């Protein structure tokens with residue numbers, strides 16, 4: 387009944403993929419209890435750094451990527467949820483269930499990737515475990531893994547970036563194509579789609 391109706395919590399940043407130095411590695415910035423409390427209140431006072439954030443809801447964890455001052459991620463992970471921030475929950479700035487894309491204003495402290503203009507097809511996918519996976523671009527929104535991996539290896543990496551050799555953002559990881567549980571290809575939201583959305 388109306389009085390007992392629950393509210394979904396915010397998406398909470400719980401870590402980041404560190405790409406600054408010469409070694410890529412995952413960092414956790416908040417443990418599961420803090421995350422649950424932060425999800426409920428929407429108030430997150432933690433310092434944010436970097437381009438690729440690890441994010442969580444009460445029930446899922448995945449990635450979020452800053453491009454042109456927007457923190458982008460997938461609708462199948464974030465739904466229409468707000469994101470926790472120092473001043474309380476922040477409403478989505480973009481929502482597109484047809485592209486499986488959402489965006490909030492990028493948190494203070496984050497760094498944004500620049501949209502690729504190279505027209506290059508040698509890409510790199512960054513996972514939540516900070517693996518940097520070579521991907522050959524195969525079409526507007528697909529790319530093949532040079533070395534196939536079991537699905538398990540990509541799970542929880544949606545929202546992560548595909549980058550060009552110059553470190554520009556080419557797309558946001560959306561879905562994996564598999565045969566017998568082995569991922570051969572990936573689907574992503576092309577950065578131009580984002581630029582249009584904006």
Ligand SMILES: CC(C)(C)OC(=O)N[C@H]1CCCCC/C=C\[C@@H]2C[C@@]2(C(=O)NS(=O)(=O)C2CC2)NC(=O)[C@@H]2C[C@@H](OC(=O)n3cc4cccc(F)c4c3)CN2C1=O
Nearest residue numbers: 446448462463484485486537540541542543544560561562
């Ligand atoms: C499209 C095609 C060719 C049929 O393929 C597949 O549907 N395959 C599957 C294989 C699943 C096995 C795990 C693979 C692991 C990693 C996959 C990256 C990943 C993930 O890490 N999610 S998450 O854990 O972080 C999650 C916690 C955040 N995404 C998923 O699972 C998505 C979610 C779901 O699809 C969607 O809801 N929509 C909605 C869309 C709207 C428009 C366009 C789209 F494409 C859309 C895709 C199925 N997904 C796949 O990938």
Ligand SMILES: [Zn+2]
Nearest residue numbers: 502504550554
């Ligand atoms: Zn580029």
